[PDB]
């Protein structure tokens, strides 16, 4: 369950303060596919990145 109010509407830098589990719950894969180009400019950790990469493989 994405916490109330916390669902990602853009792939932007305020996602850096999402926990691994919150990324998984709050970031729809479609969204992420279309704003893929943003990710490599956001200072994500290797752990956060693992989760985002898992999302895109769901697809």
């Amino acid at each position, epitope marked *: 369950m994405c*916490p109330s*109010g*916390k669902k990602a509407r853009e792939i932007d*830098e*305020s996602l*850096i*303060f*999402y*926990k*691994k589990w*919150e990324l998984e719950a709050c970031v729809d894969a479609a969204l992420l596919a279309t704003q893929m180009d943003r990710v*490599n*400019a*956001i*200072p*994500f*950790t*290797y*752990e956060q990145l693992d989760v985002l990469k898992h999302k895109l493989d769901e697809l």
Partner: antibody, heavy 119, light 107 residues
């Protein structure tokens, strides 16, 4: 043991810039974000911004955009912060602090670099 | 930006007492972390993810809170707890800190 060794006290004239540094040992530098914090003598803490050393991506507190520039040198596991066009309101102690795994706050902090801006 | 209001600003505590300090956030926070700083030292991560003991922290420290009101509790105060404790929200960019609750020890 994880260690963040910051550079010594600086003294700079209003309008000059200064580059302070933070050398990390005891872990995998690219495994963790590195953060910078400012504390004004006798005051609270403000987050300046952070950076992931692997690719150099970074993110800043708007208030510090322009004032500060974060960079790293992976091959010496050193992180740097450039402070530009200094005024007396930049006189403060600046810390680096490693972000704990998966967002668990700042789990290791450096000793602090005191910077004094005066004529 | 999320505004953190810590209270009391100065807490004075007799050793053995149980005491709680609060951090109100101006809006909703997912996790709060707390740091202890003693005059002239780097801050030290004390409680993280709202309620978990950071490494090496004595068991008498705890944390709780939901949504807007977070608290840090010392279940039995001791001479060495004299310090300033800062909360920090880890929820909305940019990260913000309270201005600290300072704990002074009664003797």
């Amino acid at each position: 043991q994880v260690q963040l060794q910051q550079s010594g006290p600086e003294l700079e004239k209003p309008g000059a810039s200064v580059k302070i540094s933070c050398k990390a040992s005891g872990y995998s530098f690219t495994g963790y974000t590195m953060n910078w914090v400012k504390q004004s003598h006798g005051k609270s803490l403000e987050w300046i911004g952070l950076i992931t050393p692997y690719n150099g991506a970074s993110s800043y507190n708007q208030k510090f955009r322009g004032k500060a520039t974060l960079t790293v040198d992976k091959s010496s596991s050193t992180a740097y912060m450039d402070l530009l066009s200094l005024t007396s309101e930049d006189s403060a102690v600046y810390f680096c602090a490693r972000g704990g795994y998966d967002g668990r706050g700042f789990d290791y902090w450096g000793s602090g670099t005191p910077v004094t801006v005066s004529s | 930006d999320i505004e953190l209001t810590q209270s009391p600003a100065i807490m004075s505590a007799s050793p053995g007492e149980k005491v709680t300090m609060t951090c109100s956030a101006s809006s909703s926070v997912s996790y709060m972390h707390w740091y202890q700083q003693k005059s002239g030292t780097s801050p030290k991560r004390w409680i993280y993810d709202t309620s978990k003991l950071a490494s090496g922290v004595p068991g008498r420290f705890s944390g709780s809170g939901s949504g807007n009101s977070y608290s840090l509790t010392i279940s039995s105060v001791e001479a060495e707890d004299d310090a300033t404790y800062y909360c920090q929200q880890w929820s909305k960019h940019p990260l913000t800190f309270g201005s600290g609750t300072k704990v002074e020890i009664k003797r």
